[PDB]
Amino acid sequence: MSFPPQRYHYFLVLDFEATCDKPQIHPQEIIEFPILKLNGRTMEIESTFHMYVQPVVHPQLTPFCTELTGIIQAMVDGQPSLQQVLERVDEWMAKEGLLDPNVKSIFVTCGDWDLKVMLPGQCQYLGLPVADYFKQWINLKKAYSFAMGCWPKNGLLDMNKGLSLQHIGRPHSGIDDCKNIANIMKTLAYRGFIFKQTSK
Numbered sequence: 001m002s003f004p005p006q007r008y009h010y011f012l013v014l015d016f017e018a019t020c021d022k023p024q025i026h027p028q029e030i031i032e033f034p035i036l037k038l039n040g041r042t043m044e045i046e047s048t049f050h051m052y053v054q055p056v057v058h059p060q061l062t063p064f065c066t067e068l069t070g071i072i073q074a075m076v077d078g079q080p081s082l083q084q085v086l087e088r089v090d091e092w093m094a095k096e097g098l099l100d101p102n103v104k105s106i107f108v109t110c111g112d113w114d115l116k117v118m119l120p121g122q123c124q125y126l127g128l129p130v131a132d133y134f135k136q137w138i139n140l141k142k143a144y145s146f147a148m149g150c151w152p153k154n155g156l157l158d159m160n161k162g163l164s165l166q167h168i169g170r171p172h173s174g175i176d177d178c179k180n181i182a183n184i185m186k187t188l189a190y191r192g193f194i195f196k197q198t199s200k
């Protein structure tokens with residue numbers, strides 16, 4: 001059955017970008033915070049949250065980081081820091097109607113890094129509580145592996161290859177990564193896949 005009933009009213013696609021360097025910067029800090037709200041049945045994008053985030057420990061973006069992500073210094077200068085962005089997310093969640101206990105939603109990420117490592121690690125560094133809706137998620141690589149019977153090698157690029165999808169936008173742009181996750185999800189649902197929480 002194409003586009004079966006799903007277990008969630010909405011899927012919240014998320015894919016951070018963070019400060020980085022060669023060798024890696026320490027600590028890393030979130031600089032782009034995108035969320036796509038997908039209709040739970042059709043996987044169509046219905047709303048977008050998108051903020052760049054001002055890094056504080058390493059406030060100047062390295063050449064490497066700007067090359068990797070396309071994010072330039074002017075995009076993070078004058079932005080709120082992560083504490084404020086998380087408060088903006090809460091407000092966005094509330095206005096979207098996602099804070100209703102009877103509206104079921106779940107974050108979807110490519111890998112576990114974003115919500116298993118990046119966000120809790122920075123919130124712990126900053127002394128900030130992590131909102132409970134960030135504590136469960138679907139790892140698309142794992143979902144893809146159940147849907148297709150195989151483990152993708154390199155993330156979104158190989159998942160698009162497996163499904164004959166053209167890449168959307170620029171790799172390592174947070175918002176464009178989110179659109180590819182959404183596109184891959186829509187295809188898995190077309191093939192009949194029912195999504196399930198994978199986080200433990």
Ligand SMILES: Nc1ncnc2c1ncn2[C@@H]1O[C@H](COP(=O)(O)O)[C@@H](O)[C@H]1O
Pocket residue numbers: 015016017018019020021024028068069171172173177
């Ligand atoms: N090849 C790489 N080298 C160093 N850091 C990376 C690399 N790829 C990703 N990162 C870091 O991981 C974050 C998330 O990666 P991604 O969703 O693949 O763009 C990036 O914003 C960088 O901070």
Ligand SMILES: [Mg+2]
Pocket residue numbers: 015016110177
């Ligand atoms: Mg990512």
Ligand SMILES: [Mg+2]
Pocket residue numbers: 015016017172173174177
């Ligand atoms: Mg990304």
